[PDB]
Design a protein around this ligand. Structure first.
Ligand SMILES: Nc1ncnc2c1ncn2[C@H]1C[C@H](O)[C@@H](COP(=O)(O)NP(=O)(O)OP(=O)(O)O)O1
Ligand SMILES: [Mg+2]
Ligand SMILES: [Mg+2]
Length: 430
DNA sequence: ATTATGACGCT
DNA sequence: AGCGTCAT
């Protein structure tokens, strides 16, 4: 009763750009705007591999990982923008720089955690407290929440046939039920968080041209889940009270970290399908199947409770360059391996020198990873060496020295390499 | 031949 | 340190 935590202590948002690489290309090329469009990498094999898809193109069934030639069968008028190629490889610099634009705007509002190139978590607890104090007892107008969905609403008892009418009816029920004179009300705190996130999203769109979606809840897992509920160009508030019904039909795999083998094991060992079904197990039972850490996490998460903090980190902690060499193109000679290590190392040096100038830090460790032909894993081997100078020839020579004894017999390289990966790690202030 | 590349856990 | 998992 009075001592059971409810996981309502924080306001956390997850902001995620809508079809991000597509919007970057559409801002640059107005002919692509408001059209079925996708971003592709590498044209020669099957038209290239799609890595981002506009919502207009998704309506035809175009998806990430599809070959462009196959996407064109579903959507003959599909427009395509190609990732830049430099030194024989895809180069993602344009999208990293667009990401920095968005992250720098978000960081004006609150401390962010960079979770991917196109999304960040926001800890809004302090910002909400401040807004609630300057705005004491004032009601919250629906006009301050023009793109917000309240998950689970409307419920109960004609315009509720179009989606915007449903959105507003749900929002009206929520606001009509708020206790606005209670500064410690979790529901009120989430609502003010949503007001701030509307402002944040308006600033992003105003200052970059890019649209995004967002989730607002009490922790990162619920904010991430909420964000996807009403994409694109909308934000969703998931309250603590909404959790039982939301989770009652929510496949386990939809919760972040449960989309792989662990979630599969939860389903198979417990014989359940939905996140809410987890409430019927004791914490010790869950720890017995999934380990102490996972068991405690699952016990809390199925009740809507999670404590993982929004880490104060706007910048990536590693800077890496990778290229696959599939099928017949696998690297089979020592000259080949050395040339591609140099290409990767030259891109890496460019990115590292810029990083040192921008961010006052230097990487101190170089990690080299390879995949051997026939291995299913993303890395067949990983070895590190010191990164003492931002020099591409030195980095590539060192990488070759750490991996060269993976070569069983030469001039020749066997078995052939199907992936090379260089990663700079262990940054220190400079 | 689903690529480029991020974070973090385990031992 | 090096491998495994999960993610966009
Ligand atoms: N598996 C992958 N491989 C390569 N690039 C990828 C990728 N997944 C995503 N990207 C790149 C390309 C993506 O544009 C970007 C962000 O990924 P999302 O946030 O998962 N998806 P998006 O923003 O496109 O659409 P929306 O969020 O509206 O559903 O990262
Ligand atoms: Mg996105
Ligand atoms: Mg994303």
């Amino acid at each position: 009763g009075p001592h059971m935590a409810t996981g309502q202590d924080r306001v956390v948002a997850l902001v995620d750009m809508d079809c991000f690489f597509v919007q970057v290309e559409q801002r640059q090329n107005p002919h692509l705007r408001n059209k079925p469009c996708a971003v592709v990498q590498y044209k020669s094999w099957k038209g290239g591999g799609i890595i981002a898809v506009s919502y207009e193109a998704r309506a035809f069934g175009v998806t990430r990982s599809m070959w462009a030639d196959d996407a064109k069968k579903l959507c003959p008028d599909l427009l395509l923008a190609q990732v830049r190629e430099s030194r024989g490889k895809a180069n993602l610099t344009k999208y990293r720089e667009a990401s920095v634009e968005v992250m720098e705007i978000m960081s004006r509002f609150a401390v962010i955690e960079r979770a991917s190139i196109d999304e960040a978590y926001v800890d809004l607890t302090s910002a909400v407290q401040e807004r609630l104090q300057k705005l004491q007892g004032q009601p919250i107008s629906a006009d301050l929440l023009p793109s917000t969905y309240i998950e689970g609403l409307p419920q109960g008892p004609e315009e509720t046939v179009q989606k915007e009418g449903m959105r507003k009816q749900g929002l009206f029920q929520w606001l009509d039920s708020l206790q606005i004179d209670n500064l410690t009300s979790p529901d009120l705190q989430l609502t003010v968080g949503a007001v701030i996130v509307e402002e944040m999203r308006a600033a992003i769109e105003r200052e970059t041209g890019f649209q995004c979606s967002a989730g607002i809840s009490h922790n990162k897992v619920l904010a991430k889940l909420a964000c996807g509920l009403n994409k694109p160009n909308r934000q969703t508030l998931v309250s603590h009270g909404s959790v039982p019904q939301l989770f009652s039909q929510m496949p386990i795999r939809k919760i972040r970290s449960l989309g792989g083998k662990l979630g599969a094991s939860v389903i198979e060992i417990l014989g359940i399908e939905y996140m809410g079904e987890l409430t019927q197990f004791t914490e010790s039972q869950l720890q017995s199947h999934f380990g102490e850490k996972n068991g405690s996490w699952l016990y809390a998460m199925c009740r809507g409770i999670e404590h993982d903090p929004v880490k104060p980190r706007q910048l990536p902690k590693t800077i890496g360059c990778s290229k696959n060499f599939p099928g017949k193109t696998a690297l089979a000679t020592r000259e080949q391996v050395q040339w591609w290590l140099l290409q990767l190392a030259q891109e890496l040096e460019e990115r590292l020198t810029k990083d040192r100038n921008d961010n006052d830090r230097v990487a101190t460790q170089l990690v080299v990873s390879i995949r051997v032909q026939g291995d299913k894993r993303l890395s067949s081997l990983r070895r590190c060496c010191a990164l003492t100078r931002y020099d591409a020839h030195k980095m590539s020579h060192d990488a070759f020295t750490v991996i060269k004894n993976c070569n069983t017999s030469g001039t020749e390289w066997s078995p052939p390499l199907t992936m090379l990966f260089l990663c700079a790690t262990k940054f220190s202030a400079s």
